[PDB]
Design a binder for this molecule. Structure first.
Ligand code: CLA
Ligand code: CLA
Ligand code: CLA
Ligand code: CLA
Ligand code: CLA
Ligand code: CLA
Ligand code: CLA
Ligand code: CLA
Ligand code: CLA
Ligand SMILES: CC1=C(C/C=C(\C)CCC[C@H](C)CCC[C@H](C)CCCC(C)C)C(=O)c2ccccc2C1=O
Ligand code: SF4
Ligand code: SF4
Lengths: 40, 80, 64, 730, 106, 163, 141
């Protein structure tokens, strides 16, 4: 398990979790309060 | 007709001599290094300007440099 | 003793070198009158892949 | 064959022939050279380029007078098309001569695009006889210069080195005589000849002594009443040829354009080149030359050293650096000439100086594009020739502590900041274009990020444009800047700038905003590619001694991870691609914004230039309809020559991709195989080459492929620019 | 899905349905065989996942647990007979059966 | 108003563009049945489109002769004429986020280089440390001026040069 | 060596059917190279130009058009079969020159007789700028 967690700490995997967060956050930020252009 | 100059930083590795195919580099004794060897370039008329030697040199910067210049039949590697 | 101490870090002053104004460990020093006795080892590689090079007394100075 | 170089002559291959041409006019590297013989060979060669210029101009005059319609054009300048030179191609067919004979002339012809008809007509040429007389004049002047390049090379008449390195005398003679007196005389021509020719009077060598330019003569000039020459200017209802609506003025400050010929007033341009003559003669008497008075150049540079030491020693040591380095002097001249060439492009389309040029839509384009393309080529040379200075003619110990060494010391900061500007400009410009490409595509054209260029509209309001409503000083009647120059220039200037049917300060929108930002990205990155090749010319960490090798070399080998395209020549090589890309955008933006103006539908550019598909749909694909149908299977129009050239460019551009992508090693093994066949064949083996065949060198291919690349990048657009604009006639 | 823009891609294809128009020819392939309902496609998908895991399991088994020797690989003559008769021969004979009993009667 | 631009509420082309974009959906809506899912999808797009246009008008945007909204960048005109949310306020929002990425990556680089084998820490990250710094960077401007005023931000001629 | 070995132009060659990588018109006109070596048994080796050939027990001789073609073969024989080849240079005039083991000892081993050539007594870099030698040839010499 120590080696599995180490594999998960590689660059390709940590980047995959980052991408799901940033993309998931932005798509969710467009789904709610739809299509923003001016900021109030 | 290329130019091959070796500088003061040689350490007598002989890797330049083993690499260059055309036998343009040989080892000569010297008192400057631990190995008591230094390179030389007696026959540059046979230099094809491949520049493999410079790659062999394992110093911070090259103690062997092949300054390209005027061409010839032997330098251009022409079988014809 | 002729030169810096074993295991001592020093800063390089060759303008030609990849390691210029950079620090490296002194691996050894020869006291037989050689022009470039001081052997130095760095962690970072150069462009070729070599991490050591023999420098001179005047070309090296104290760290930082 | 190269006598100037023995090293290449001993070469047995074809590399001798190629390198013999390219190193021909590089006098420094020649064998047995001397600094004194260098300047003399240059001085003689510079006479040559004059000889080709004056002959090239003589050829246009003759070929126009003999074959053109200059006499017919002046009578109806708007409708009649000019004629450049006739055609004799025996490979034509009968439909082609019937199509290419569109002009009034009998045989087929080529319609002109330069604009020389509008220029010659303005300065007072109204006959073909006067062009014949002129073509002889320049051909004589051309022969005189050839005789001088030979004469000033002889044992006698051979200038010494001290004569060349006399900067103070060259400035005074060239600023006062070449610039000033020439500008003074051109005013003498506009007054004594051209303005009369506009107002009907025929002035020539027969009658220029008897005819007065002004009724009063010179008595106002001596008395001091210099305002008498500006009393009765030409009226608005004035035909450019006849005396209807004429005046007596020769020097005036009306400002603005002439109504009929949308062009600058001749009396203004006459007044212009006069004042330029005065400043330039005054500036000519500045430096010291064989008399006690005058400034010295070296004393000035040594003095302008700031005390605190922000620049160290300052400008010390630079005089001997500039005066002895020819590459330094050449970079500054190209830098200055390159920039000026862009001004000529930017200031002519907005301020037409010639008669009936605003109406000739095809002619305005070509001239603007030709000057802009040359601007980039000249600018690239200034850096490149600036990089050679650092290798050959730079001495660090002499130039120690000065501005030139202090720049070269911290170059890592300059190249870093330049890179950041290009990255930020490139990422944001591409992003805005993409964001609008998509959001248009999903049917929502209101979600676009359209930012108004407020800072530029602030200027046009501060220069007379009342559309935006900023109400700045010169758009406000109460301000003093409106009060001053109210009697002089503003009534004519305010009328033109506020007119939205001319190219003087066109309306700006958010589409013009993105195009300007895209340009900035190209200009900053192009400089970064060049600046790097200059500052890192002396050395890099990968190659601490580039200076020992030269400006142009292959590479330092596959060692140290790879050193292909390090030399400063390879930086110039890569910048030309960007240069063409930058001028392309600059020129694509000029053409479309003007087509929409000429077609009347300005809304085409404002709405569609905000997203990239508009550029591909509305500008490229749409205006390439009449052109592509130049030779149809049914028939052929007069635009067939342009469609043929259209493809000719598309092809030459692709052939360069071979020399760029495919390198040498694939080919030399191939030529070795053909050599085997030529010797083993029974009868062909009897024939044997004198020089051995080998593939082209590495640096040669970079050059050759760039030529095939740039020629296609010019011949393609020139056809598209002329055909699109000529077929619509608007 | 329905996000910013995007939905317009779900064009009016026809059949009480809107989506991206494909150009793979799967629909004509599934009709050449006897396929009238969607239930036949679901099973066909679950079979692939079952066989695919078997394939993946095999690669771990044939390498990590029980891996053949070089002698097994050099039995090239054996491979040709099994690949020709077994895979291409019976494979084609099998398909004929399905076409005769399903692809033709449907 | 400013720069000869009309507000989007008063513009005619702005409403013309609304009537156009809705007409496309109404024509597309005629094909399908009322209670079907394609009908619900298009009605939602109709609802979003009607909301996009009214919100941009309510926000005091400026529409040109073409009928599309334009943005203003100078903070003086933005604040004077109430157009600050367009560009001037988006600039501060981004800089806080951009600085956060820099202050975080700079700290992970410095701290891993204080230990043995920093090369391995780049390809194989210390995720507990990276998350710690990522949640400690909310006040990145304070630390920067703290590090600038102190002098431990910049290095001093201990860097490699080339000549 | 003790003495330069003169060329024996009549020695048996390897068993090689022939190829197209052989000699061209340059060889008869300008120069060509020949290599000699002595093998203890009959073996197979790769030629630089072409394919495989069979050596012969005893002396062997080849003819090549380039020095690299010859030295490429020495590196193969010295490594694979551990032999000691020696090759010459033959001009069109018939003159012969003994090249590679010119001292008898291979260049990668020192010998007292050798004298240094093209030896600069300075560090790389640390040399004058091109401006100092602007009007004659050479910054490195
Ligand atoms: C006042 C103008 C001026 C002057 C006096 C010089 C003078 C010189 N330049 Mg310079 N240069 C200039 C402008 C100028 N240049 C500009 C504007 C640029 C930017 C493009 C350059 C770029 C430049 C480079 C990059 C180099 C020089 C070099 C040189 C030196 C001579 C090289 C030589 O003999 O080449 C002779 C070369 C030729 C005869 C070949 C030119 C062939 C051209 C490219 C083909 C053109 C296409 C074809 C004809 C099109 C036909 C159309 C077809 C359809 C029919 C000499 C000091 C060289 C130098 O100093 O080396 C150290 C050098 O490397 N110059
Ligand atoms: C108007 C342009 C122009 C001018 C003034 C010159 C001038 C000169 N050329 Mg040049 N040349 C030109 C265009 C020009 N060339 C072009 C376009 C080519 C390519 C075909 C050449 C190719 C060329 C060669 C090959 C040689 C010259 C040589 C010379 C010099 C001969 C002495 C008289 C002289 C300085 C000769 C030279 O180097 O003299 C020193 C020489 O050998 N030129
Ligand atoms: C550099 C200047 C220049 C240039 C580029 C041309 C170009 C041309 N001339 Mg021209 N010409 C010139 C100066 C020039 N001329 C001068 C100064 C004279 C006076 C002697 C002439 C007298 C002349 C005659 C008499 C003829 C040409 C012709 C031609 C064309 C023949 C094709 C060719 O290879 O050339 C061509 C368009 C021939 C033609 O048929 O033109 C269509 C022709 O018959 N020319
Ligand atoms: C910038 C100066 C300048 C320029 C470019 C022109 C240009 C022109 N003039 Mg003009 N002119 C000028 C000044 C100038 N003028 C001045 C100051 C006057 C007042 C006297 C006139 C009075 C005048 C008249 C009255 C006429 C012209 C005409 C002409 C046209 C034809 C000239 C021709 O074919 O050569 C013909 C040349 C000669 C007959 C001999 C010229 C003798 C001078 C002194 C030689 C100068 C050579 C000069 C030094 C060359 C430079 C190279 C140098 C190194 C050798 C041409 C557009 C004629 C025309 O039809 O225009 C509409 C015409 O009839 N001009
Ligand atoms: C490297 C960044 C950069 C560069 C090179 C340019 C370059 C240019 N801009 Mg510009 N601009 C920028 C950033 C930049 N801009 C930014 C961030 C904005 C706000 C979104 C604008 C808004 C803007 C407007 C409204 C206009 C221009 C215009 C122009 C052109 C004329 C110069 C001018 O008056 O503009 C202004 C010059 C500046 C604003 C310099 C500021 C650059 C800062 C230091 C970088 C960003 C710092 C960061 C935001 C904090 C010119 C080519 C005018 C034009 O389009 O020509 C017709 C014009 O109307 N720009
Ligand atoms: C439109 C661009 C272009 C053109 C014209 C060519 C042309 C050619 N390529 Mg390239 N190729 C290209 C793009 C192009 N390629 C690019 C960008 C790449 C990069 C991958 C490659 C990579 C490449 C490789 C690696 C090789 C080729 C080969 C060839 C040659 C094949 C022999 C042949 O068919 O010639 C026939 C002649 C023509 C096709 C020219 C057609 C135009 C007409 C016929 C010429 C008219 C002449 C005219 C009448 C005379 C006027 C004289 C005038 C001075 C008066 C040929 C010359 C092969 C080769 O050279 O070996 C055989 C080779 O192996 N190509
Ligand atoms: C395989 C088919 C093919 C190919 C390979 C080409 C290739 C080429 N065409 Mg072409 N063309 C084709 C088909 C093809 N065409 C067809 C079918 C037509 C219609 C019949 C045309 C009509 C056409 C025209 C009218 C023109 C070309 C041009 C060109 C050349 C421009 C290359 C370049 O990099 O310039 C530079 C590329 C650009 C500047 C970008 C392309 C246009 C962009 C979208 C404009 C954006 C400008 C603006 C500032 C935004 C960019 C900024 C950015 C930061 C976002 C190029 C070699 C042009 C040319 O001759 O070269 C000068 C030219 O004017 N083509
Ligand atoms: C990345 C590679 C690739 C991809 C993405 C695709 C994608 C596609 N293929 Mg294709 N195919 C490929 C490679 C690829 N193919 C190659 C290299 C071949 C040469 C053998 C074929 C032969 C092929 C055929 C004959 C057909 C497709 C079809 C299709 C389409 C339907 C997919 C499907 O499941 O049909 C499934 C296919 C079948 C049910 C019939 C397969 C019959 C072949 C002949 C079986 C041969 C297998 C055999 C054991 C392997 C060769 C033996 C060896 C000795 C050569 C689809 C768009 C079908 C189509 O057109 O769609 C409508 C179609 O008929 N493919
Ligand atoms: C902490 C990481 C980091 C930091 C603090 C910086 C900081 C800086 N960079 Mg930079 N850079 C980085 C990573 C970083 N960079 C990476 C990974 C690359 C390779 C793509 C580059 C490539 C690069 C170039 C080409 C340039 C800079 C430049 C600059 C300077 C101006 C800002 C800029 O526009 O850069 C550009 C910004 C980018 C290219 C985006 C970088 C990619 C992401 C957004 C950042 C990486 C964050 C990291 C992966 C997260 C790790 C966090 C950790 C806890 C796990 C600036 C001081 C410019 C300069 O020289 O200054 C004058 C410049 O020209 N950088
Ligand atoms: C095709 C090709 C060759 C070989 C091309 C050759 C040998 C063609 C040159 C010789 C022909 C006969 C000249 C053709 C004539 C020209 C059309 C006109 C030349 C005009 C000048 C005399 C001014 C290279 O040597 C080469 C080298 C490096 C990178 C790429 C390449 C490359 O792509
Ligand atoms: S250039 Fe090539 S052949 Fe000549 S000495 Fe160097 S490596 Fe050997
Ligand atoms: S230019 Fe060619 S030979 Fe030189 S390093 Fe690059 S790929 Fe290798």
């Amino acid at each position: 398990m120590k080696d599995f967690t180490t594999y998960l700490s590689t660059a390709p995997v940590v980047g995959l979790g980052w991408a799901i967060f940033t993309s998931g956050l932005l798509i969710e930020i467009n789904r709610f309060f739809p299509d923003p252009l001016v900021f109030s | 007709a290329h130019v091959v100059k070796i500088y003061d930083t040689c350490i007598g590795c002989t890797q330049c001599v083993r690499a260059c195919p055309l036998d343009v580099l040989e080892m000569v004794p010297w008192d400057g290094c631990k190995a008591a060897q230094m390179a030389s370039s007696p026959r540059t008329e046979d230099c094809v300007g491949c520049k493999r030697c410079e790659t062999a040199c394992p110093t911070d910067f090259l103690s062997v440099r092949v300054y390209l210049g005027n061409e010839s039949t032997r330098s251009l590697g022409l079988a014809y | 003793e002729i030169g810096p101490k074993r295991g001592s870090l020093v800063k390089v002053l060759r303008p030609e070198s990849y390691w210029y104004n950079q620090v490296g460990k002194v691996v050894s020093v020869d006291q037989s009158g050689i022009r470039y006795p001081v052997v130095v080892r760095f962690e970072n590689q150069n462009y070729a892949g070599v991490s050591t090079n023999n420098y001179a007394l005047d070309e090296i100075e104290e760290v930082k | 064959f190269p006598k100037f170089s023995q090293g290449l002559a001993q070469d047995p291959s074809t590399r001798r022939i190629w390198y013999g041409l390219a190193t021909a006019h590089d006098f420094e590297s020649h064998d047995g050279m001397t600094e004194e013989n260098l300047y003399q060979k240059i001085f003689a060669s510079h006479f040559g380029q004059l000889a080709i210029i004056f002959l090239w101009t003589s050829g246009n005059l003759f070929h126009v007078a003999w074959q053109g319609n200059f006499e017919q054009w002046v009578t109806d300048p708007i409708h009649v098309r000019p004629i450049a030179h006739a055609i004799w191609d025996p490979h034509f067919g009968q439909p082609a001569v019937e199509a290419f004979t569109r002009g009034g002339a009998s045989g087929p012809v080529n319609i002109a695009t330069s604009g020389v008809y509008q220029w010659w007509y303005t300065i007072g040429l109204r006959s073909n006889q006067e062009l014949y007389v002129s073509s002889v004049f320049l051909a004589l002047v051309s022969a005189v210069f050839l005789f001088a390049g030979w004469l000033h090379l002889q044992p006698n008449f051979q200038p010494s080195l001290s004569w060349f390195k006399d900067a103070e005398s060259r400035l005074n003679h060239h600023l006062a005589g070449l610039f000033g007196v020439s500008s003074l005389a051109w005013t003498g021509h506009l007054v004594h000849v051209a303005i009369p020719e506009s107002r009907g009077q025929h002035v020539g060598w027969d009658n220029f002594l008897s005819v007065l330019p002004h009724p009063q003569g010179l008595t106002p000039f001596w008395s001091g009443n210099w305002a008498a020459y500006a009393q009765n200017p030409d009226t608005a209802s004035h035909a450019f040829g006849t005396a209807d609506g004429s005046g007596t003025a020769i020097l005036t400050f009306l400002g603005g354009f002439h109504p009929q010929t949308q062009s600058l007033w001749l009396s203004d341009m006459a007044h212009h080149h006069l004042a330029i003559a005065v400043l330039f003669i005054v500036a000519g008497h500045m430096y010291r030359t064989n008399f006690g008075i005058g400034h010295r150049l070296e004393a000035i540079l040594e003095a302008h050293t700031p005390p605190a030491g922000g620049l160290g020693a300052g400008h010390k040591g630079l005089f001997h650096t500039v005066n002895n380095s020819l590459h330094f002097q050449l970079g500054l001249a190209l830098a200055s000439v390159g920039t000026i060439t862009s001004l000529v492009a930017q200031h002519m389309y907005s301020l037409p100086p010639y008669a009936y040029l605003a109406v000739d839509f095809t002619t305005q384009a070509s001239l603007y594009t030709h000057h802009q393309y040359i601007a980039g080529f000249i600018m690239c040379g200034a850096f490149a020739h600036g990089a050679i200075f650092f290798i050959r003619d730079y001495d660090p110990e002499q130039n120690k502590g000065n501005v030139l060494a202090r720049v070269l010391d911290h170059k890592e900061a300059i190249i870093s900041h330049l890179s950041w500007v290009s990255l930020f400009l490139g990422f944001h410009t591409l992003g805005l274009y993409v964001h609008n490409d998509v959001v248009q595509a999903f049917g929502t054209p209101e979600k676009q990020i359209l930012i108004e260029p407020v800072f530029a509209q602030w200027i046009q309001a501060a220069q007379g444009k009342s559309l935006y409503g900023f109400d700045l000083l010169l758009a406000s009647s109460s301000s003093p800047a409106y009060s001053a120059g109210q009697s002089l220039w503003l009534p004519g200037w305010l009328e033109a700038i506020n007119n939205n049917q001319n190219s003087l300060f066109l309306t700006i929108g958010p589409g013009d905003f993105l195009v300007h930002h895209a340009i900035a990205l190209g200009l900053h990155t192009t400089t970064l590619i060049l600046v790097k090749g200059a500052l890192d010319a002396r050395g890099s960490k990968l190659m601490p001694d580039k200076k020992d090798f030269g400006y142009s070399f292959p590479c330092d080998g596959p060692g140290r991870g790879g050193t292909c395209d390090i030399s400063a020549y390879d930086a110039f090589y890569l910048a030309v691609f960007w240069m063409l890309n930058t001028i392309g955008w600059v020129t694509f933006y000029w053409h479309w914004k003007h087509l929409t103006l000429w077609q009347g539908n300005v809304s085409q550019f404002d709405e569609s230039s905000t997203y990239l598909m508009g550029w591909l749909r509305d500008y490229l694909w749409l205006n390439s309809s009449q052109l592509i149908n130049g030779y149809n299977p049914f028939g052929m129009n007069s635009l067939s020559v342009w469609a043929w050239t259209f493809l000719f460019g598309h092809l030459v551009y692709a052939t360069g991709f071979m020399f760029l992508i495919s390198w040498r090693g694939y080919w030399q093994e191939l030529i070795e195989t053909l050599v085997w066949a030529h010797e083993k064949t029974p009868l062909a083996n009897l024939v044997y080459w004198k020089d051995k065949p080998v593939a082209l060198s590495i640096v040669q291919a970079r050059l050759v492929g760039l030529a095939h690349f740039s020629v296609g990048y010019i011949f393609t657009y020139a056809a598209f620019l002329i055909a699109s604009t000529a077929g619509r006639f608007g | 899905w329905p996000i910013v823009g995007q939905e317009i891609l779900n064009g009016d294809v026809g059949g009480g349905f809107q989506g991206i128009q494909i150009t793979s020819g799967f629909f004509q392939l599934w009709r050449a065989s006897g396929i009238t309902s969607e239930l036949q496609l679901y099973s066909t998908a679950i079979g692939g996942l079952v066989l695919a895991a078997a394939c993946f399991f095999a690669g771990w088994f044939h390498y990590h647990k029980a891996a053949p020797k070089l002698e097994w690989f050099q039995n090239v003559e054996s491979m040709l007979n099994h690949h020709l008769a077994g895979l291409l021969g019976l494979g084609s004979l099998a398909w004929a059966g399905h076409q005769i009993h399903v692809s033709l009667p449907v | 108003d400013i720069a000869g631009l009309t507000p989007c509420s008063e513009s005619k082309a702005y409403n013309k563009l609304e009537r156009k974009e809705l007409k496309v959906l109404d024509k597309r809506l005629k094909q399908y049945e009322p209670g079907s899912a394609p009908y619900l999808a298009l009605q939602a797009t109709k609802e979003r489109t009607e909301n996009r246009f009214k919100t941009y008008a309510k926000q005091g945007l400026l529409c040109g002769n073409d009928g599309l909204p334009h943005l203003i960048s100078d903070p003086g005109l933005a604040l004077r004429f109430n157009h600050a949310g367009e560009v001037f306020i988006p600039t501060f929002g981004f800089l806080y986020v951009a600085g956060y990425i820099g202050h975080v990556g700079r700290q992970y680089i410095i701290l891993s280089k204080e230990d043995a084998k920093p090369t391995d820490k780049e390809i194989i990250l210390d995720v507990p440390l990276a998350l710690k710094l990522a949640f400690q960077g909310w006040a990145w401007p304070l630390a920067s001026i703290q590090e600038l005023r102190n002098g431990s931000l910049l290095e001093k001629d201990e860097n490699i040069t080339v000549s | 060596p003790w003495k330069q070995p003169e060329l024996d132009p009549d020695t048996p060659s390897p068993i090689f059917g022939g190829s197209t990588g052989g000699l061209l018109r340059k060889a008869q006109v300008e120069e060509f190279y020949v290599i000699t070596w002595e093998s203890p048994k009959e073996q197979i080796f790769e030629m630089p130009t072409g394919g495989a050939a069979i050596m012969r027990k005893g002396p062997n001789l080849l003819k090549f058009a380039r020095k690299e073609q010859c030295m490429a073969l020495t590196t193969q024989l010295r490594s694979k079969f551990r032999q000691t080849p020696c090759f010459y240079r033959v001009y069109a005039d018939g003159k012969v020159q003994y090249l590679h083991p010119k001292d008898g000892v291979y260049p990668e081993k020192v010998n007292a007789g050798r004298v240094g050539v093209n030896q600069n007594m300075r560090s790389i870099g640390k040399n004058v700028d091109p401006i100092k030698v602007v009007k004659f040839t050479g910054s490195e010499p």
